[PDB]
Design a protein around this ligand. Structure first.
Ligand SMILES: *[C@@H]1O[C@H](CO)[C@@H](O[C@@H]2O[C@H](CO)[C@@H](O[C@@H]3O[C@H](CO)[C@@H](O)[C@H](O)[C@H]3NC(C)=O)[C@H](O)[C@H]2NC(C)=O)[C@H](O)[C@H]1NC(C)=O
Ligand SMILES: *[C@@H]1O[C@H](CO)[C@@H](O[C@@H]2O[C@H](CO)[C@@H](O[C@@H]3O[C@H](CO)[C@@H](O)[C@H](O)[C@H]3NC(C)=O)[C@H](O)[C@H]2NC(C)=O)[C@H](O)[C@H]1NC(C)=O
Ligand SMILES: *[C@@H]1O[C@H](CO)[C@@H](O[C@@H]2O[C@H](CO)[C@@H](O)[C@H](O)[C@H]2NC(C)=O)[C@H](O)[C@H]1NC(C)=O
Ligand SMILES: *[C@@H]1O[C@H](CO)[C@@H](O[C@@H]2O[C@H](CO)[C@@H](O)[C@H](O)[C@H]2NC(C)=O)[C@H](O)[C@H]1NC(C)=O
Ligand SMILES: *[C@@H]1O[C@H](CO)[C@@H](O)[C@H](O)[C@H]1NC(C)=O
Ligand SMILES: *[C@@H]1O[C@H](CO)[C@@H](O)[C@H](O)[C@H]1NC(C)=O
Ligand SMILES: *[C@@H]1O[C@H](CO)[C@@H](O)[C@H](O)[C@H]1NC(C)=O
Ligand SMILES: *[C@@H]1O[C@H](CO)[C@@H](O)[C@H](O)[C@H]1NC(C)=O
Ligand SMILES: *[C@@H]1O[C@H](CO)[C@@H](O)[C@H](O)[C@H]1NC(C)=O
Ligand SMILES: *[C@@H]1O[C@H](CO)[C@@H](O)[C@H](O)[C@H]1NC(C)=O
Ligand SMILES: *[C@@H]1O[C@H](CO)[C@@H](O)[C@H](O)[C@H]1NC(C)=O
Ligand SMILES: *[C@@H]1O[C@H](CO)[C@@H](O)[C@H](O)[C@H]1NC(C)=O
Ligand SMILES: [Ca+2]
Ligand SMILES: [Ca+2]
Ligand SMILES: [Ca+2]
Ligand SMILES: [Ca+2]
Lengths: 779, 779
């Protein structure tokens, strides 16, 4: 009853089932001026009719085989939901009629002797919003509903849907797989579009939750339908164009993506690559070659293919007249042949060949959902069989007491369906869990343009083994994948391009983390990693490179030990010591010849003890550069004509005591400074307050000025071959050297602050020897 | 029929309605050993019973008033959903019994003469998952459903729910308001918890979508229920503790938050402040004083209060025996008095006062949902009235032909309900939109502990005017708000604390943007803003401060024009020029007295033309510092005893020609360098390759060495009061000055590179005058 397009056949036990023979209802709206009448469905679904044939086929095979349910035939009242909740509820109200005794005891019947014998288990409602509406109704009467293609996670909530089983995997696996795919191809900037019903809406929440643990931040999320208006589709495609994310994850059904794909190919937005949900990844409404400019190379999902024998030929035996138990065969025939059956459109002969025309009823490669229909009706049969072969004292009910077959109630069938364990034709075990659902392995496909009048061929490119460990479930042989239909390289789909190791990562205010900016980091970068969030700081021994990479450029080594700018001065000091030694040999062969020889050799020989890399000892050894000059300058008070003569310890020991007092004041320690940036490693010996200044002013600025005060009366006086004038010239030369020393010493640094001191000491020690020894020898 | 707990009363036209008298069903599960029987509901809902009384009250008021629907009474079969889809569907299958003629024509009736006269409009199903299940069923028969409290956005989809109206606002406004609240108090780190049904699940998607335009990034999102297990509640509160976000947005119903609040107060997680959805913001299951340690100061939402007169006393007239048309009064009485009515628990007298005991049936302040029930049944009445007062040729149906009253069908009532326009007792217009829903203004509340044996008082702290402009809808008088029950300052709820203007903002890899890190930025920060994402670069005139704030510290001004380190040298140059001028006056009073006076005055007077801030002219004027010395050094070849004498242009004009050739080689331009970092603004005049070196070696290193070659025979020769020896001493002094000049010039910079040149020039010009003029005068 109810609708007048059934597929009815009697039996001892009647199943019943629901199928999408059409695609939706007529788009006309009731203004409710007249009495509102039944809406007509509009498009036609050959794949849905094939699914109906798959249910019918297994019913006939069970009824023919005596090895399963003998002496007992099965019936079916298959209705047709035109993919809508209203058309589904119209049918499943006629399912529960003889069951309407419990609450409404006012049934009275008065309509049939068998009173429309009760259905025992419905099969289906492919739509997930359809099954949610039907299972609310069939949970009052505990009739088991075995869906074949409704696959949302809301239906696995057994406090509300108390009688619901399904032979399709849940969608907590598929939304994980579409996160693992993006994690495998390494994108981080995607977009989501879901159908606004119970298939896409809770299926995209799982994807949003499971693509934030992998930090794939999502650009946009928009909801579509199949009854949306042009402003909504406009808003959606403006969001699509207005963003830059090439990977779009569409979690939607077949005919709900149709108004979006129509509009996008009408506006020619080429470039986006679509991940596909399981519903429309193999869909004859989107797999059209005129759409291939935009939809191409879409990575999809499909369930594991099944094998049904003889079903291919059972499909061929269809006829509008020969099928008495099939109300849909006629409208199928006149749809596939554009006829008009009699009992614009030509009248139909009724002898046509179905394999002539091309239609998705028979043009197919793999049984996927038809296998699930087949498995569902076999599972109902095997639960009935395990009711049929139960012995007393062994059953599943109270006190082990099982029940009969001829008076069987639906809750018993549900009880035996919960504890099911049986084997396929493909030899696999089939069990429903505590939430009543199979688990299977998806087979990832890819849409290819078959270039010999073929519309679109689906090339299998991998799988997704849900049985394996987490982290390793996804195997993609990615040699076959033609991104956007033709290409071979993986398209870029990040938000910002990952820039190099010269820079760190800086951000934009109010934007997701998957796109950034990158700015170079200065003065000690050592930015070693490729996508560092903050480049490090260089260690104190090194300085950053030109291109700011890892700092192996180290600091300075300013010592000047064997440098060619100091080796010549070392040679000059050696020649000065040797010129002192030859004069010593002449003055030995042929106290003023002893002390003013030895100390004058010492002040010229120990001057080379301050060139190179300093330390504690070589930094404390700069006070003998005053002490040896103090002893060598005793000639100016010892060799005068107005000369007891060994009393030079009146001032030399005073200088030694001042140096001993300054050894605590100024340090015996070389100190580094960092005055430049890159090569600024120095050593400068850090004279404390005034120690060297006081020593110099107490010895060398005093001895020459005292000798000038005594030889101011001797410079205009010849004595001992003009030794007075020669000593006055030597004192003036030493005063000139110490006048040249001071500001050039005070204004320079590092390598060039020891070189001036050693040059001044060599100048004094060479001058005091040359103005004395040559005049004393050659005369 | 159906259930045996009705509230039934006859009438010409019967309404029917659904109400949550209990809170849920018994937690026992069917193992399905026996035949499964009807589940019993468990808790009791006094507020739900008050809502039922509010429906009954307005039905009696309409039936008493002759000014609305005269000569026509109204009936009602009010059932009770125990807040479940199954208990609702049991009732609304008994609603549609006489309507079951269209599809199932096998009704036959055979049960009643009037055949259970048809309901015309149901009222309610407060649960949004309950109304979604009922409205799928009542859209086949086009019965108008007027919900009073189901308020999700899925129900406003008129392709599927073709007959559904509601007198409660949608929840696209409330989820916007809870984003505007957080935007007003300026947090950016919140957490969301929603009930896993159709009230919280699509209501939190609107909040997630509308709190990313304001960049309030969400920490966690977890779904709860009321039939969840202890592992799930454990997982949720571990997520709550394990995070640091004090603002938690709970979008859930009354009894679904109960298992979470029980567990949280059992684990004493104090500190989180709860934003409240409209459902549980005024709920007698969560507003309990023992829970106040955790739930306190929760900002809530409530609908606009209504005013019903006499309803307070109509509630008082209740009795289990006097109410013949109310099956719930008995179980209400024995629940509110712990009696046991007869026809552990004491037997009940049946004379008790209801206002004695405290219960949410009568302990209330504002009618909120009861007003919506009242408005719903008045709206049904007024649509019936506008059917009743229609004239022919005027109606809303086809050809203007309206229909009668005595044979009225439900779709006509739906047609008149769509075009409704009527006025309240509070004088406001009530219209349903094209999606069939009122719009109202929420009144934001806050939970306060009434400290005189009061449980929890709800203090109104503002509103949310949805009629106003976007951006300005939310008014919170925030002087009343006690955060966490007692405090007064707004609690901090950001992810990272907003740090200061010394630093920029750096990020952590794999974390949301609402928390960051902040690192100081070096060497030209000028980080002026308070939360800059990247501090700027300082301009070329300035350098960054110590605390890296806005760089008003500028660069150097190294010129030394009127400095006290150059003013003394300016005084020395003026005294040198005056000492030249007095010798000029003496040599005038009492060519070697003309040229060697004027050029020797010029080389000492023009030396002050190179101290200060240089320019093009003052940078080109350093070649006369060679030219004037070249003319003043002609005395060494003009005043000799072996002296035609005006042939000084043999070398002075050669020097002038070399200077003219060098005026193109070396620039007449002062050049800046930046050798230090902070104060490094210099000007150094950038001598080109060798121009000044060639000029110096061609004039001053040549004239003295040529004069020494001629006076080597004259230094041991007195002539003209020893002028030869005096000129030899002057030439030696000039050679000493030029020997002191060179490396101290080559090794210094900036301010201290002009000071050495001007000192050397003053030393030469003072020496050549002092060794000549005094000896020529005093003799
Ligand atoms: C879009 O942005 C993605 C950031 O999420 C980039 O993903 C990065 O890819 C790198 C490889 O290309 C990964 O490097 C790997 O790091 C692990 C350490 O965990 C190493 O063992 C691997 O050897 C190393 N791979 C290689 C080839 O060296 C990054 O870890 C990964 N980033 C993250 C956060 O996981 C995408 O590369 C980028 N896409 C494009 C096209 O630039
Ligand atoms: C948590 O983080 C929030 C960031 O989202 C901070 O919000 C910031 O608050 C500031 C005021 O406290 C805002 O400054 C305002 O900026 C506007 C310019 O658009 C000016 O007109 C206002 O005068 C100015 N307000 C003041 C008082 O100067 C920031 O704009 C705002 N940030 C954003 C992105 O909107 C919260 O302050 C922070 N919470 C705590 C406790 O630190
Ligand atoms: C699940 O997917 C896996 C992977 O494709 C399939 O496991 C394979 O099974 C065959 C037969 O046992 C083995 O030869 C292969 O080695 C397996 N692959 C592995 C272990 O990686 C499996 O058939 C799929 N289906 C089911 C129901 O498990
Ligand atoms: C909506 O909220 C607004 C704000 O509280 C209410 O508007 C006020 O209405 C009264 C009466 O007309 C005026 O005196 C106030 O000035 C209004 N407030 C404004 C304009 O900010 C209004 O009553 C609420 N309800 C409805 C149905 O609009
Ligand atoms: C797309 O970008 C343009 C450019 O500003 C803007 O005007 C338009 O509103 C955007 N559309 C959407 C849907 O954001
Ligand atoms: C769309 O673009 C593709 C390539 O840019 C081009 O081949 C095709 O003709 C375009 N179609 C339309 C309708 O613009
Ligand atoms: C035993 O079985 C009978 C009927 O099968 C049942 O009524 C009884 O309750 C059972 N007793 C037990 C203990 O299981
Ligand atoms: C029952 O199912 C389990 C796993 O689901 C399987 O191991 C076992 O073999 C099954 N029983 C039979 C008899 O096949
Ligand atoms: C909470 O944090 C602890 C500390 O690492 C961790 O062991 C635990 O798993 C966390 N719990 C959750 C729910 O993340
Ligand atoms: C919870 O904590 C509050 C304050 O820290 C304290 O007053 C209260 O006694 C605690 N309760 C329990 C059960 O620990
Ligand atoms: C006029 O009204 C009659 C009955 O009310 C109806 O049958 C007819 O179709 C109407 N015609 C028009 C043009 O509205
Ligand atoms: C009908 O409703 C509109 C707004 O909804 C209002 O302006 C008008 O006054 C109403 N009509 C009557 C008669 O009140
Ligand atoms: Ca399809
Ligand atoms: Ca933003
Ligand atoms: Ca409540
Ligand atoms: Ca992360």
């Amino acid at each position: 009853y109810g609708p007048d397009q059934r597929a009815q056949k009697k039996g001892d036990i009647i199943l019943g089932g629901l199928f999408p023979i059409h695609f939706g209802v007529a788009a006309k709206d009731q203004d409710l001026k007249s009495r509102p009448e039944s809406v007509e469905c509009i498009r036609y679904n050959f794949r849905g009719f094939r699914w109906l044939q798959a249910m019918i086929f297994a019913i006939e095979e069970i009824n023919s085989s005596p090895a399963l349910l003998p002496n007992l035939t099965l019936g079916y009242r298959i209705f047709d939901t035109c993919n809508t909740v209203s058309k589904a509820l119209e049918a499943t109200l006629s399912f529960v009629a003889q069951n309407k005794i419990d609450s409404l005891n006012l049934d009275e019947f008065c309509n049939c002797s068998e009173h429309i014998p009760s259905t025992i288990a419905v099969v289906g409602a492919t739509g997930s919003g359809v099954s949610t509406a039907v299972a609310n109704l069939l949970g009052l009467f505990y009739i088991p509903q075995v869906s074949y293609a409704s696959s949302s996670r809301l239906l696995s909530n057994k406090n509300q849907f108390k009688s619901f089983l399904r032979t399709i995997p849940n969608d907590e696996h598929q939304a994980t797989a579409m996160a693992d795919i993006i994690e495998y191809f390494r994108w981080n900037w995607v977009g989501t579009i879901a159908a606004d019903d119970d298939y896409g809406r809770p299926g995209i929440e799982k994807f949003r939750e499971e693509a934030e643990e992998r930090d794939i931040c999502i650009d946009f999320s928009e909801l579509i339908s199949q009854y949306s208006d042009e402003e909504e589709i406009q808003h959606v495609v403006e969001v699509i164009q207005n963003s830059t994310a090439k990977v779009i994850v569409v979690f939607s059904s077949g005919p709900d993506l149709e108004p979006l794909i129509k509009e996008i190919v009408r506006r020619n937005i080429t470039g986006k690559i679509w991940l596909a949900s399981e519903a429309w990844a193999s869909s004859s409404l989107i797999a059209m070659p005129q759409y291939f400019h935009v939809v191409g190379g879409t990575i999809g999902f499909a369930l594991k293919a099944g094998q049904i024998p003889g079903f291919r030929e059972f499909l061929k035996k269809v006829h509008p007249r020969k099928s008495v138990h099939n109300g849909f065969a006629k409208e199928f025939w006149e749809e596939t042949f554009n006829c008009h059956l009699q009992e614009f459109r030509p009248l139909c002969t009724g002898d046509e060949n179905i394999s002539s025309v091309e239609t998705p009823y028979i043009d197919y490669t793999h049984l996927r959902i038809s296998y699930n229909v087949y498995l569902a009706v076999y599972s109902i049969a095997h639960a009935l069989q395990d009711i049929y072969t139960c012995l007393p004292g062994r059953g599943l009910f109270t006190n082990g007491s099982c029940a009969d077959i001829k008076k069987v109630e639906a809750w018993q069938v549900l009880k035996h369906l919960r504890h099911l364990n049986f084997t396929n034709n493909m030899g696999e075990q089939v069990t429903f869990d505590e939430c009543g659902d199979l688990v299977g392995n998806y087979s990832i496909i890819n849409w290819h343009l078959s270039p010999e009048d073929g519309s679109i061929v689906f090339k299998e490119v991998g799988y997704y083994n849900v049985y394996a460990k987490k982290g390793e479930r996804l195997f993609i042989n990615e040699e076959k994948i033609l991104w956007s239909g033709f290409s071979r390289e993986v398209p870029f789909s990040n938000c910002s391009r990952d820039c190099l190791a010269g820079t760190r990562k800086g951000i934009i205010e109010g934007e997701p983390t998957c796109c950034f900016e990158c700015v170079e980091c200065p003065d000690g970068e050592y930015s070693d990693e490729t996508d560092a969030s903050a480049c490090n700081k260089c260690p104190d021994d090194f300085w950053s490179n030109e291109n700011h990479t890892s700092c192996i450029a180290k600091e300075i080594e300013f010592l000047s030990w064997t440098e060619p700018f100091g080796i010549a001065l070392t040679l000059f000091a050696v020649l000065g010591i040797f010129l002192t030694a030859f004069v010593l040999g002449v003055f030995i062969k042929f106290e003023l010849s002893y002390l003013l020889l030895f100390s004058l050799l010492c002040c010229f020989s120990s001057s080379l003890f301050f060139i190179g890399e300093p330390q504690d000892w070589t930094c404390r050894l700069r006070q003998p550069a005053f002490g040896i000059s103090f002893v060598l300058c005793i000639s100016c008070i010892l060799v005068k004509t107005n000369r007891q003569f060994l009393l030079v310890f009146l001032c030399t020991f005073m200088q030694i005591v001042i140096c001993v007092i300054w050894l605590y004041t100024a340090p015996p320690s070389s100190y580094r400074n960092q005055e430049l940036e890159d090569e600024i490693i120095f050593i400068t010996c850090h004279e404390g307050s005034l120690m060297a200044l006081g020593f110099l002013i107490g010895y060398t600025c005093l001895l020459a000025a005292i000798c000038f005060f005594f030889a101011f009366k001797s410079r205009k006086l010849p004595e001992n071959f003009n030794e007075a004038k020669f000593i006055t010239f030597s004192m003036l030369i030493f005063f000139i050297v110490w006048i040249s020393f001071i500001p050039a010493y005070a204004s320079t640094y590092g390598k060039f602050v020891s070189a001036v001191e050693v040059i001044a000491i060599l100048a004094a020690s060479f001058g005091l020897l040359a103005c004395i020894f040559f005049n004393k020898i050659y005369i």
